[PDB]
Design an enzyme around this catalytic site. Structure first.
Site, PDB file in Angstrom:
ATOM      1  N   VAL A   1      40.731  40.961  46.531  1.00  0.00           N
ATOM      2  CA  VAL A   1      41.302  41.285  47.582  1.00  0.00           C
ATOM      3  C   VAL A   1      41.265  42.958  47.681  1.00  0.00           C
ATOM      4  O   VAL A   1      41.890  43.522  46.766  1.00  0.00           O
ATOM      5  CB  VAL A   1      42.876  41.250  47.665  1.00  0.00           C
ATOM      6  CG1 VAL A   1      43.623  41.086  46.294  1.00  0.00           C
ATOM      7  CG2 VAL A   1      43.698  41.546  48.831  1.00  0.00           C
ATOM      8  N   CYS A   2      40.598  43.525  48.767  1.00  0.00           N
ATOM      9  CA  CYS A   2      40.623  45.143  48.748  1.00  0.00           C
ATOM     10  C   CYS A   2      42.027  45.587  48.557  1.00  0.00           C
ATOM     11  O   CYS A   2      43.135  44.893  48.854  1.00  0.00           O
ATOM     12  CB  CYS A   2      39.861  45.385  50.128  1.00  0.00           C
ATOM     13  SG  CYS A   2      38.368  44.645  50.349  1.00  0.00           S
ATOM     14  N   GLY A   3      41.997  46.862  48.184  1.00  0.00           N
ATOM     15  CA  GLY A   3      43.335  47.684  48.031  1.00  0.00           C
ATOM     16  C   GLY A   3      44.205  47.250  46.893  1.00  0.00           C
ATOM     17  O   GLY A   3      43.900  47.951  45.771  1.00  0.00           O
TER      18      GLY A   3
END
Length: 136
Positions: free
Chosen positions: A31-33
């Site tokens: 998951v990005c971030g």
């Protein structure tokens, strides 16, 4: 004038180092971030975590409260401050019990136990970045 002059990083001290043979296993999804944050702190600390892929496995409220209570402390003093929602619902009320506390947590997104980080010095939730940052 778009950027504001403000200094933060610099009045703190970090300590961590050691040889290889690391033994850290993480269980979650890409998951990005978030993944970037956790990976940054870990990679920066000098640890090589293992990306494990396990099928969904949602545990019952009793299991969550038992794990969260046995992990560190009861669910009464678990909801961090950042979780304004927790205090917003009046959970901080000393006239409450594990009943309402758990029922509330199980309803809130904070119940997300999917992301779990396992270290040779202890185990804790891989996310949010705050939890993992506290464990590491």
């Amino acid at each position: 004038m778009a950027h504001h002059h403000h200094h933060h990083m610099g009045t703190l001290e970090a300590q961590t180092q050691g040889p290889g043979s690391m033994d850290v296993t993480i269980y979650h999804n890409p998951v990005c971030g978030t993944s970037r944050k956790v990976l940054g702190m870990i990679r920066e600390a000098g640890i090589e975590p293992h990306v494990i892929e396990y099928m969904k496995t949602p545990l019952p409220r009793d299991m969550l409260v038992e794990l969260l209570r046995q992990m560190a402390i009861s669910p009464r003093a678990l909801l961090r401050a950042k979780e304004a929602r927790y205090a917003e619902l009046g959970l901080d009320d000393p006239a409450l019990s594990d009943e309402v506390l758990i029922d509330a947590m199980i309803s809130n997104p904070v119940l997300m136990n999917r992301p779990v980080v396992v270290t040779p010095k202890g185990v804790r939730l891989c996310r949010p970045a705050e939890t993992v940052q506290e464990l590491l």
